Amino acid sequence: FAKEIDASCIKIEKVIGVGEFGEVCSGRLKVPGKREICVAIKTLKAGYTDKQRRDFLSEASIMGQFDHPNIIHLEGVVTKCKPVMIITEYMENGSLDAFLRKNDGRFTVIQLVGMLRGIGSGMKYLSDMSYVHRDLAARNILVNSNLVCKVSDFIPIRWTAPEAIAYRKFTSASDVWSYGIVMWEVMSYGERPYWDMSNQDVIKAIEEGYRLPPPMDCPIALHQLMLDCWQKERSDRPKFGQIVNMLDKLIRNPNSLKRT
Numbered sequence: 001f002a003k004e005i006d007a008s009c010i011k012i013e014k015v016i017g018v019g020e021f022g023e024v025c026s027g028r029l030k031v032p033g034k035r036e037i038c039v040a041i042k043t044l045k046a047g048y049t050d051k052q053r054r055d056f057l058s059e060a061s062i063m064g065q066f067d068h069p070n071i072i073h074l075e076g077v078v079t080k081c082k083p084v085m086i087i088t089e090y091m092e093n094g095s096l097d098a099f100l101r102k103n104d105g106r107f108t109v110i111q112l113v114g115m116l117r118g119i120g121s122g123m124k125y126l127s128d129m130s131y132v133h134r135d136l137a138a139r140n141i142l143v144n145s146n147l148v149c150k151v152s153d154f155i156p157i158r159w160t161a162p163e164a165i166a167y168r169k170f171t172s173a174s175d176v177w178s179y180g181i182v183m184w185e186v187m188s189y190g191e192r193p194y195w196d197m198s199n200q201d202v203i204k205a206i207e208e209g210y211r212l213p214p215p216m217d218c219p220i221a222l223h224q225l226m227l228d229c230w231q232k233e234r235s236d237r238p239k240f241g242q243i244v245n246m247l248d249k250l251i252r253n254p255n256s257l258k259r260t
């Protein structure tokens, strides 16, 4: 379950984002005898019904099940008071996509692989627990000042495995397809998968065996892993545990990254 936070322990600073669901703010959380931390705060949109509130505190419930360094950390919720809130750890560099696009070219290959290794590690934990994300993309990964990447966001054609589009068959294996797309996003500093191709173009390309090329200057071993993730038969794709082990190995033997 999710912890109740006394609203007096919370100080809101600024609105950092908006959406149909409401607003996300940044602020500070100070519990007595504990160090103050920065936090992000998600609030339910004005005039919400009881149904909507329940659907909101349901997302906190789910998040509350996860305790892993690469999954966004739930501080708690406010429910004694109005409006309801969900409080998470503050992630200084925000969303991964936006982040890479503002820093195009600035990191090393090894740093990028580190980010991908963290994301892979969070997805292994998620799928270990029989949870399917369904919406895995760089926009739904958050990034802290130490470049630690954490899975967030508890449909998008370009990111979705063929069997999930065709049969609405969503599993950890279609999450692995999506992870492959994330690797490509990362190594490209946030380029749009499939560029100006339309959704229909993408669907038919995939079906005919088209797969995205290496991003510019991307190691061959990394692109080969993307290709593994995009195997047509879902059973042919690597498991997240194998993805993480492969990335540890590339990291452990940095010469394997030389070939581009």
Ligand SMILES: Cc1ccc(F)cc1-c1nc2[nH]nc(N)c2c2c1CCCC2
Binding pocket: 017, 024, 039, 040, 041, 042, 072, 086, 087, 088, 089, 090, 091, 092, 093, 094, 095, 142, 152, 153, 154
């Ligand atoms: C507030 C919130 C609730 C649920 C959830 F899954 C994630 C969050 C959350 N936590 C955050 N920490 N640091 C951020 N920059 C940040 C953001 C969000 C959501 C919108 C994007 C920004």
